[PDB]
Amino acid sequence: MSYDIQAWKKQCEELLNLIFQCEDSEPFRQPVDLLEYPDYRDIIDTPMDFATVRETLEAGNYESPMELCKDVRLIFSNSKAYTPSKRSRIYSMSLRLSAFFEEHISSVLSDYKSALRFHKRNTI
Ligand SMILES: [Ca+2]
Questions:
Q1: Which of 4, 42, 55, 81 is most buried (CB neighbours < 10 A)?
Q2: Which locations, inside or outside the cell, does it occupy?
Q3: Helices (H), 33-88
Q4: Residue 42 Cα, ligand 1 centroid: separation in angstroms?
Q5: Domain count, the chain
């Protein structure tokens, strides 16, 4: 629907589904095992992963798609910070998936911004 403040929830649910099914998401699907990799929290302040993102959205615990976007971007910035070189195949995966996410999220954010101005201002 045009001017739908709820539309982002379905749009982001679909986008996450397409990310989970993409081979490039494999390293990012689940929280890093902090017991297997006990230096991970030495480097990364705030772990994030696509399963946490998907559960947060399904729970209704994101206020806006900007919040979900900030979490997804944290996945990719965490991977950049943790991986040791741009030669890492894991970093390479994070670049391909990042570029895919950013291509699709822009219209979700734009559509949400317009919907919210309508929600706040309309005299229907
Ligand atoms: Ca790095």
A1: 4
A2: Nucleus
A3: 40-43, 50-58, 65-82
A4: 14
A5: 1
Question: 40: Cβ–Cβ under 8 A, 6 or more apart, which residues?
Answer: 32, 34, 47, 82
Query: In degrees, to the nearest 5, what angle opens at C-alpha 105 toward C-alphas 101 and 107?
Result: 140
Give me ligand 1 centre to Cα 70, in Å. Answer: 19
57 C-alpha to center of ligand 1: Å? 29
Range of the domain at 20: 1-124
Resolution of the structure, angstroms: 1.5
Distance 51 CA to ligand 1 centre (A): 23
Q: Ligand 1 mean position to 82 CA, how many Å?
A: 5
| Euclidean distance between CA atoms 57 and 69, whole angstroms | 11
d(CA 74, CA 103): 17
Instruction: Give the amino acid at 110.
Output: S
